[PDB]
Design a protein around this ligand. Structure first.
Ligand code: CLA
Ligand code: CLA
Ligand code: CLA
Ligand SMILES: C=Cc1c(C)c2cc3nc(c4c5[nH]c(cc6nc(cc1[nH]2)C(C)=C6CC)c(C)c5C(=O)[C@@H]4C(=O)OC)[C@@H](CCC(=O)OC/C=C(\C)CCC[C@H](C)CCC[C@H](C)CCCC(C)C)[C@@H]3C
Ligand SMILES: CCCCCCCCCCCCCCCCCC(=O)OC[C@H](CO[C@@H]1O[C@H](CO)[C@H](O)[C@H](O)[C@H]1O)OC(=O)CCCCCCCCCCCCCCCCC
Ligand SMILES: CCCCCCCCCCCCCCCCCC(=O)OC[C@H](CO[C@@H]1O[C@H](CO)[C@H](O)[C@H](O)[C@H]1O)OC(=O)CCCCCCCCCCCCCCCCC
Ligand SMILES: CCCCCCCCCCCCCCCC(=O)OC[C@H](COP(=O)(O)OC[C@@H](O)CO)OC(=O)CCCCCCCCCCCCCCC
Ligand SMILES: CCCCCCCCCCCCCCCC(=O)OC[C@H](COP(=O)(O)OC[C@@H](O)CO)OC(=O)CCCCCCCCCCCCCCC
Ligand SMILES: CCCCCCCCCCCCCCCC(=O)OC[C@H](COP(=O)(O)OC[C@@H](O)CO)OC(=O)CCCCCCCCCCCCCCC
Ligand SMILES: CC1=C(/C=C/C(C)=C/C=C/C(C)=C/C=C/C=C(C)/C=C/C=C(C)/C=C/C2=C(C)CCCC2(C)C)C(C)(C)CCC1
Ligand SMILES: CC1=C(/C=C/C(C)=C/C=C/C(C)=C/C=C/C=C(C)/C=C/C=C(C)/C=C/C2=C(C)CCCC2(C)C)C(C)(C)CCC1
Ligand SMILES: CC1=C(/C=C/C(C)=C/C=C/C(C)=C/C=C/C=C(C)/C=C/C=C(C)/C=C/C2=C(C)CCCC2(C)C)C(C)(C)CCC1
Ligand SMILES: [Fe+2]
Lengths: 48, 28, 31, 36, 30, 31, 67, 76, 348, 48, 36, 33, 33, 484
């Protein structure tokens, strides 16, 4: 169980960081990058 | 004239971690 | 802590809440 | 003459809810210790 | 009086949860 | 061969086998 | 717009005038490395003395030094 | 770099390693059995934990001269 | 570089060699990571195999002594050595490698090499991210484990009387460290371990929920009952329906993500914040600024002999832990407590 | 307060009885009950 | 390099690993660390 | 206390009956597919 | 020098310089092949 | 549409408003210094320098003001306990007023440098765009810093022009602001040697000037210029954050372990003085020396200063405290009034018994009275049934030498148990707790609070180094990435 929660934290951080880093440039500076993604984008906004 | 042996034997009961005990401990 | 802790808790509740509400109202009025 | 670096801060409602929740949860957590 | 403060804080948290559930900003598709 | 991958494999293999032999020998000690 | 001209600004212009000027190659990076090396050794000596891993002849490293 | 499957399925790799992997294993077994491990890493043998006068666990209790203290506390 | 590349220098050759995409990327950070990490792990294995703690903690903590993987541990040195760095050439070991092992210098060796290995690994993450042109969010995330390691294995022992109270590198030794923290510092009651627990449990919750939701909102994209084959690494369309997931969690839970970037940033954010808060709490404990007691309840219990809460029972448990563990956990104290002074319940 | 251990030593767990959020709790059922089912209508009064 | 199929190598290595683990458990029940 | 018991029995029976007879009323055909 | 610990410290500096130069020379030799 | 956590980036590319905001932070810091000094002076009790010094009352800026030379006050009282004949303008109130007026002046200057942001000084003479020559700026400001460091080391602390710094005896009994002679030998690196502080601040300062003259004359090389991202202000921010958290770690370590710059007469004792019996050994050595002179025990203990005994008390240990045990040390434990004396415990046989002192780790510690040979002879048992080393069973009596109870012997078991429990904490003192309504739990001394605060800041600023430096190196991709 300890290995599971530590692995959950590790893999959550790892996956979130990888997806956030791979997030393709659809929004420039002067605003948050979250504006680049749209709820109906129906496409991968990150370079897997 | 201070008896160093008695000084150490007084500090040890109250506090065994005193630097008096640990200094030159292998000599004892 | 009868009063000093009470004042600390009240300020910690009030100041950030007022800041956030003011920012949200300004945002909603501007856009 | 006006400063070109002027920008406007924005705060959507989800951010407002997150901030209020953070403030009140921190108050809940630390109020027991503050009153001691 | 401490109980009053704790109850107020819990009520505030629950009210914030209620507003965030039933008065959320609609998720805008595209 | 003796490439970087060769060194990376053998830095964790030779000590590993030596220690496995050591631990196996330890398994048959009488106090 | 041209900006604001003030006596202090005119006085201090030369200090900020040559912005971006560099030297070809690595320049004085080798001397920088030597200085960094010596500083690391110096900090190591100081940490050793304070940690008592480096006993010195005239250094007591204790409150008795106040005497 | 050759794929691992090609190397691990190659007869040459196995004939090379079948005299070295057992050699390392036997080296480790000899290292433990011949008493070298105790000699170099200083872990006391099962009959060396307690001396004639020290019938309890040892205590370093000294910052400097700790070499002499641990030497006299260890098995002689 | 910018205006021109000038001439190729020996640094250029070294960079070109180190930056090659071989099986094991070394890079410039490798020169610090590989030796330090290799020596740290090898030192832990040698210590858990051959090195003992008979002279440091008066405990047998190696395989050759009869310990297993659970109970073997590279124990921290004796308390009388204080915060000595315990160099193998230092004034303690004075060059005797065997005695340096006996004095516990292997713990300092492993800890320092591991700290520099963690520095090298974050440097490796930065270097690799820069090579592939990605925002180095994973190095920023890995800052949290570095903070935990620094605050627990370095800051905390330095705040105490010596390395002796650091966590010894082992399983049962870590468990001893945990129980010691509960008994002495009342670490559970500390709001910073509370925030750390919340962060770690929330991170595990997010991992499980995101995995399940993605695996249960997949688009068909294939005719086989094995849904893993119906995916191409280079495809552009999302493999799962974000709209369906948002609707499902909105109607089940009340609120739901509507932004993939925000979702994954939240997944990154929760555990890092939890670990950083726990690290701040551990610093506070290093100074013994423990959130041990609520003085109001202690005063009320002292005045009122019938007022009892779970907090007071926890205080009694901590008292028992301290009294019954002090004698053997801290041999340097030489605590020969008679059995009549140890706190104890009834008929137990 | 609730006599959790069944030794007639009640434990206070509510805010009104001098507890904060950290120490407050809903005390488990009395040890005298054991695994017995204890609905409201089983007790003689709300106080019990 | 098709000789000595990879599945055979894997099976033999796994058998050796399981045997080593069993030897370790046996040593856990006898000799040093056996509580007798 | 008897009145409370009979009231709770009525409530529980009502809700459990709703559950049982709602999952029987052609539930598997209530999917979009 | 005066203190044995100082002599050991200086020898440690020399040894660390030796290993660092060994790493640098190794990377240079492999880079130039 | 800047998010709330990016608003203060508006001045990233505006040098004038950067000056303005940095002026505002400086003004706020100076105002805090002045206001904190005023509050501390208002709530400070200067009557009793012994048994009630600054570190007992929770003073935080008074230790630093006293350390650097400011000792007197306009109220007629001196921190050393004498009378203020002429405190001058550099009293505590003077320092507070000066920092306050400086805060106001910096506020006005911040307003001005904010309104007139578009100064031609910040324009690149060639291109006409706004730019800052960061290498030259660092050279200038480093030259200034080195000049000031040398000036402080050579004139201040040495007393050539300044007043000196706080120098004390090893046991913190007689300390005062004195000029310090520089230590140019190896002993200048003894952390507890005061003479290192001038010499260092001299030599280092000199180097700074020379270093300035280099980083002001010699332009950085192109490879180094692009490698270290010189020309981006955020690179400077990353490097500065790193340096500042390094310095925070150093100062936290040097205060927790104590040094010549953090005397115990201003911040209180360290926990390592209690752990190693720094004061207990000295007290017993003085007692033994007096006994060897032929004096009785009562006279030998009466010769012990009360301040030295007060240091030998676990309530003054900085590591006996709580995170939310707030306020002055007097708020937890009462205000010290006097020294009861030294308690000597003796069994009915006449064998002298010593009470085992509470280690710093233990919130509660059982009472054990130990023979000279480390053999437990008595205790306050937890199980009074079939006890073996009970006070009544062994017949322990306590005689007090010196202090308030001088030559007084108590034999009733209740009083002996009470005094043994008190003596497990160190020297026994009388405390007046009614004045401040002390609850009865130990607080932490100002050195503990300083170390905790600056260590937490050091960790957070390590994360700051990481974040702002990652933003520096990856500036091109931190606006987004173009896939691979
Ligand atoms: C990635 C390379 C690397 C790094 C960063 C370290 C770092 C460290 N090692 Mg280590 N070591 C390494 C490689 C490395 N080692 C290798 C390859 C070996 C095998 C020979 C060793 C074997 C070794 C031993 C046996 C010990 C250490 C120890 C230490 C620690 C003490 C530092 C010290 O005082 O050394 C020396 C200080 C310097 C080198 C300062 C730099 C001076 C430069 C290089 C030259 C300037 C001198 C010039 C003449 C003027 C330290 C954290 C000690 C330890 O573990 O502490 C418990 C210890 O005893 N190491
Ligand atoms: C002197 C050091 C320093 C300086 C000059 C800056 C400057 C900056 N930071 Mg940075 N940072 C620092 C240290 C510093 N930081 C440290 C130590 C950390 C680790 C905690 C961070 C972590 C950090 C993050 C994660 C981010 C920045 C960002 C930024 C930029 C925008 C800041 C902003 O507008 O937020 C606005 C601030 C507020 C709206 C108020 C927040 C209130 C806080 C939570 C509590 C109030 C503190 C209290 C009043 C003052 C006490 C602090 C003092 C005792 C130290 C800005 C140029 C942002 C950026 O990258 O720009 C794009 C951003 O994302 N910083
Ligand atoms: C690092 C800087 C620093 C340090 C080391 C100190 C240290 C000290 N201060 Mg001080 N102070 C500071 C900055 C600092 N202060 C600043 C910036 C101000 C201006 C506001 C003050 C104003 C001030 C006053 C008015 C007083 C002190 C006092 C004291 C002394 C009492 C001990 C104490 O702090 O109680 C305990 C400290 C704490 C419990 C703070 C814990 C920090 C927690 C973890 C923050 C978490 C907040 C949380 C996230 C939010 C939720 C809480 C919410 C429910 C309210 C002590 C030596 C007192 C004194 O001795 O009188 C002379 C006193 O009355 N200070
Ligand atoms: C016990 C918990 C725990 C472990 C064991 C662990 C382990 C690891 N995490 C890594 C990564 C990460 N961890 C991350 C977030 C987290 N990690 C967490 C918790 C853990 N993470 C948590 C809670 C989070 C959330 C914040 C991130 C974001 C990353 C990565 O990017 C990275 C990765 O790629 O993962 C796949 C790997 C890279 C480490 C490495 O090779 O360094 C180099 C080797 C070194 C430094 C030598 C180790 C020396 C150590 C420090 C001291 C000696 C330790 C002994 C050898 C072992 C003692 C064992 C006993 C105590 C039982 C490694 C497998
Ligand atoms: C972040 C990223 C980097 C991570 C890791 C970097 C690698 C290694 C870091 C460790 C280097 C420092 C180790 C030695 C520290 C030391 O010896 O301290 C211990 C010694 C003091 O030593 C103590 O002194 C006391 C008073 O006399 C007592 O005698 C104690 O018995 C004695 O242990 O102090 C120093 O040598 C340096 C102090 C100043 C530096 C502080 C470093 C930061 C830690 C602060 C903790 C504060 C509390
Ligand atoms: C509003 C939010 C307030 C939060 C702080 C409330 C403190 C509780 C209180 O009321 O006491 C406030 C205390 C004073 O507390 C009072 O003191 C009195 C005597 O002067 C009496 O003892 C009173 O009983 C006592 O309540 O003083 C403070 O203001 C605390 C100073 C804050 C700084 C402490 C050191 C720095 C610590 C952390 C720095 C940050 C580290 C990173 C983050 C972690
Ligand atoms: C391994 C074998 C251990 C030998 C055991 C051993 O070293 O003995 C220590 C050795 C012993 O010398 P002695 O002091 O015994 O010699 C004089 C005696 O007569 C008096 O003590 O001291 C040294 O010469 C300096 C040590 C440097 C050598 C240690 C490491 C060498 C390079 C690593 C440097 C640190 C890593 C960081 C580099 C960046
Ligand atoms: C004891 C532990 C052994 C069994 C563990 C049960 C595994 C339950 C899955 C946990 C993940 C939660 C749902 C997450 C989830 O839905 O996963 C998604 C995934 C669905 O894959 P497919 O449905 O395409 O797999 C083919 C067959 O399952 C056809 O239905 O589940 C699996 O891959 C099962 C793999 C077999 C595992 C063999 C063991
Ligand atoms: C039927 C069961 C009903 C009970 C469920 C209760 C639901 C709780 C929802 C509250 C969320 C509060 C945040 C609002 C803000 C909010 O939710 O905005 C909605 C947000 C989705 O927003 P977006 O995806 O548009 O976010 C992107 C934005 O940055 C702008 O694009 O969802 C989330 O952020 C994650 C969901 C919250 C994760 C769970 C929250 C856990 C907190 C629990 C608090 C415990 C208190 C205990 C009482 C003392
Ligand atoms: C300390 C020191 C050093 C170093 C050393 C080293 C680096 C070593 C290495 C070492 C090593 C590197 C070792 C290894 C080990 C390994 C092992 C010991 C193995 C383990 C494994 C196992 C036990 C298995 C398990 C299992 C089975 C049986 C079944 C299935 C599953 C699994 C696989 C899990 C030096 C020189 C610096 C000098 C000084 C001191
Ligand atoms: C997991 C896995 C693996 C594997 C591993 C291993 C190690 C295996 C083994 C296996 C095995 C190794 C198995 C075995 C089998 C056997 C059997 C199945 C037999 C049976 C028998 C019977 C049934 C009968 C008996 C009898 C009796 C009853 C009586 C008398 C007579 C006799 C004895 C005959 C691999 C790599 C592939 C990969 C994938 C995964
Ligand atoms: C305008 C002007 C003036 C002046 C006035 C005045 C009177 C000023 C003052 C002002 C002031 C009077 C200032 C002060 C400030 C303060 C500060 C700036 C502080 C703050 C605080 C903080 C920031 C803290 C935070 C925290 C807490 C609360 C809790 C724990 C943690 C911590 C510590 C972080 C004159 C006349 C010269 C004339 C000219 C103009
Ligand atoms: Fe994902």
């Amino acid at each position: 169980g300890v290995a599971g929660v530590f692995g959950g934290s590790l893999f959550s951080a790892m996956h979130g960081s990888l997806v956030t880093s791979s997030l393709i440039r659809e929004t420039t500076e002067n605003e948050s990058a979250n504006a680049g993604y749209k709820f109906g984008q129906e496409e991968e906004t990150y370079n897997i | 004239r201070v008896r160093t042996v008695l000084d150490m034997d007084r500090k040890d009961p109250a506090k065994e971690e005193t630097v008096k005990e640990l200094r030159k401990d292998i000599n004892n | 802590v009868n009063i000093l802790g009470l004042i600390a808790t009240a300020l910690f509740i009030i100041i950030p809440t007022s800041f956030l509400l003011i920012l949200y109202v300004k945002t909603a009025a501007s856009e | 003459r006006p400063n070109p670096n002027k920008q406007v801060v924005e705060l959507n409602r989800s951010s407002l809810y997150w901030g209020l929740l953070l403030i009140f949860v921190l108050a809940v957590l630390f109020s027991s210790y503050i009153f001691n | 009086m401490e109980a009053l403060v704790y109850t107020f804080l819990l009520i505030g948290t629950l009210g914030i949860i209620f507003f965030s559930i039933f008065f959320r900003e609609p998720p805008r598709i595209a | 061969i003796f490439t970087v991958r060769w060194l990376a494999i053998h830095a964790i293999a030779v000590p590993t086998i030596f220690f496995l032999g050591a631990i196996t020998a330890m398994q048959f000690i009488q106090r | 717009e041209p900006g604001i001209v003030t006596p202090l600004g005119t006085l201090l212009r030369p200090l900020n005038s040559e912005a971006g000027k560099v030297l070809p190659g690595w320049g004085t990076t080798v001397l920088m490395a030597v200085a960094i090396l010596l500083f690391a050794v110096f900090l190591l000596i100081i940490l050793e003395i304070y940690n008592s891993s480096l006993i010195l002849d005239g250094v007591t490293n204790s409150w008795e030094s106040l005497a | 770099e050759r794929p691992f499957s090609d190397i691990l399925t190659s007869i040459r790799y196995w004939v090379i390693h079948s005299i070295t992997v057992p050699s390392l294993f036997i080296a480790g077994w000899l290292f433990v059995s011949t008493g070298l491990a105790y000699d170099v890493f200083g872990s006391p043998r099962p009959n060396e934990y307690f001396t004639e006068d020290r019938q309890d666990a040892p205590l370093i209790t000294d910052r400097f001269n700790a070499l002499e203290q641990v030497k006299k506390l260890s098995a002689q | 570089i910018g205006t021109y590349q000038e001439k190729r220098t020996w640094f250029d050759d070294a960079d070109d060699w180190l930056r090659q995409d071989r099986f094991v990327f070394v890079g410039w950070s490798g020169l610090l990571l590989l030796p330090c990490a290799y020596f740290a792990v090898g030192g832990w294995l040698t210590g858990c195999t051959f090195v003992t703690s008979w002279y440091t903690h008066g405990l047998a903590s190696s395989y050759i002594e009869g310990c297993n993987f659970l109970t073997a541990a590279v124990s921290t040195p004796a308390n009388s050595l204080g915060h000595s760095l315990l160099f193998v050439w230092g004034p303690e070991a004075q060059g005797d490698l065997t005695r340096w092992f006996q004095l516990g210098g292997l713990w300092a060796f492993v800890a320092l090499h591991g700290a520099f290995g963690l520095i090298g690994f974050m440097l490796r993450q930065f270097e690799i991210a820069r090579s592939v042109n990605l925002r180095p969010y994973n190095a920023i995330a890995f800052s949290a484990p570095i903070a935990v390691f620094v605050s627990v294995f370095l800051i905390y022992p330095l705040g105490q009387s010596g390395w002796f109270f650091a966590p010894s590198f082992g399983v049962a030794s870590i468990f001893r460290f945990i129980l010691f923290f509960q008994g002495f510092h009342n670490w559970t009651l500390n709001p910073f371990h509370m925030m750390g627990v919340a962060g770690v449990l929330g991170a595990a919750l997010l991992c499980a929920i995101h995995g399940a939701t993605v695996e249960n909102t997949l688009f068909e994209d294939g005719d086989g009952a094995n849904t893993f084959r119906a995916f191409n690494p280079t495809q552009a369309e999302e493999t799962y329906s974000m709209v369906t997931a948002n609707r499902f969690w909105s109607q089940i839970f009340g609120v739901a993500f509507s932004n993939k970037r925000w979702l994954h940033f939240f997944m990154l954010f929760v555990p890092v914040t939890g670990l950083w808060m726990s690290a701040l709490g551990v610093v506070g404990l290093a100074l013994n600024l423990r959130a041990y007691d609520f003085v109001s309840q202690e005063i009320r219990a002292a005045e009122d002999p019938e007022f009892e809460t779970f907090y007071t029972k926890n205080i009694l448990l901590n008292e028992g832990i301290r009294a019954w563990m002090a004698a053997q956990d801290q041999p340097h104290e030489k605590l020969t407590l008679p059995e009549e002074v140890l706190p104890r319940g009834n008929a137990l | 307060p609730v006599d959790i251990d069944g030794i007639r030593e009640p434990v206070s767990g509510s805010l009104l009885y001098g507890n904060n959020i950290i120490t407050g709790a809903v005390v488990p059922t009395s040890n005298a009950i054991g695994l017995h089912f204890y609905p409201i209508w089983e007790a003689a009064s709300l106080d019990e | 390099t098709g000789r000595i199929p990879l599945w055979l190598v894997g099976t033999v290595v796994g058998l050796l690993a399981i045997g080593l683990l069993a030897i370790f458990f046996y040593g856990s029940y006898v000799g040093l660390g056996s509580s007798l | 206390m008897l009145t409370l018991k009979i009231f709770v029995y009525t409530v529980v029976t009502f809700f459990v009956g709703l559950f049982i007879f709602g999952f029987l009323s052609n539930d598997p055909s209530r999917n979009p597919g | 020098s005066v203190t044995p610990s100082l002599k050991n410290f200086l020898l440690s500096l020399v040894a660390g310089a030796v290993v660092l130069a060994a790493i640098a020379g190794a990377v240079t030799a492999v880079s130039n092949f | 549409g800047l998010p709330w956590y990016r608003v203060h980036t508006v001045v990233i590319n505006d040098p004038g408003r950067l000056i303005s905001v940095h002026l505002m932070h400086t003004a706020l810091v100076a105002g805090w210094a002045g206001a904190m000094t005023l509050f501390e002076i208002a709530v400070f009790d200067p009557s009793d320098p012994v048994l009630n010094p600054m570190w007992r009352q929770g003073m935080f800026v008074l230790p630093f003001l006293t350390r650097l030379g400011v000792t007197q006050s306009w109220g007629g009282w001196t921190i050393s306990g004498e009378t203020s004949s002429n405190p001058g303008i550099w009293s505590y109130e003077g320092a507070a007023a000066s920092h306050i007026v400086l805060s106001g002046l910096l506020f006005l200057a911040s307003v001005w440098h904010w309104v007139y942001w578009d100064l031609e000084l910040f324009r690149d003479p060639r291109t006409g765009k706004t730019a800052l020559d960061l290498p030259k700026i660092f050279g200038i400001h480093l030259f200034l810093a080195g000049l000031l460091c040398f000036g402080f080391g050579a004139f201040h602390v040495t007393g050539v022009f300044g007043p000196g710094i706080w120098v004390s005896d090893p046991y913190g009994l007689t300390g005062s602001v004195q000029p310090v002679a520089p230590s140019w030998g190896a002993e200048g690196f003894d952390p507890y040697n005061p003479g290192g502080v001038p010499a260092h601040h001299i030599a280092a300062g000199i180097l700074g000037v020379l270093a300035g003259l280099f980083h002001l004359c010699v332009r950085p090389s192109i490879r180094l210029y692009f490698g270290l991202s010189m020309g981006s202000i955020e690179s400077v921010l990353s490097s500065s954050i790193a340096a500042v958290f390094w310095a925070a770690f150093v100062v936290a370590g040097t205060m927790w372990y104590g040094s010549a710059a953090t005397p115990i007469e201003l911040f209180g004792p360290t926990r390592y003085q209690w752990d190693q019996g720094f004061f207990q050994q000295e007290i017993q050595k003085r007692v033994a020396q007096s006994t060897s002179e032929g004096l009785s025990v009562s006279e030998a203990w009466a010769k012990i200063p009360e301040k030295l005994a007060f240091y030998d008390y676990i309530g003054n240990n900085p590591a006996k405290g709580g995170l939310f045990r707030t306020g002055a040390m007097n708020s937890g434990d009462g205000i010290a009034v006097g020294w009861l004396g030294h308690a000597s415990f003796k069994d009915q046989e006449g064998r002298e018994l010593f009470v085992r002192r509470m280690p710093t780790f233990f919130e509660t510690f059982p009472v054990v009275l130990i023979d000279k040979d480390g053999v437990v002879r008595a205790d306050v048992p937890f199980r009074k049934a079939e006890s073996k080393y009970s006070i009544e069973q062994v017949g322990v009596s306590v005689t007090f030498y010196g202090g308030e109870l001088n030559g007084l012997t108590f034999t009733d078991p209740s009083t002996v148990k009470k005094y043994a429990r008190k003596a497990q904490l160190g020297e026994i003192f009388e405390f007046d707790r009614s004045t401040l309504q002390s609850d009865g739990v130990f607080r932490s001394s100002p050195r503990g609070w300083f170390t905790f605060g600056h260590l937490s800041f050091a960790l957070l600023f390590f994360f700051g180094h990481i974040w702002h430096g990652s933003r520096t190196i990856f500036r091109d991709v931190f606006a987004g990435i173009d896939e691979d």
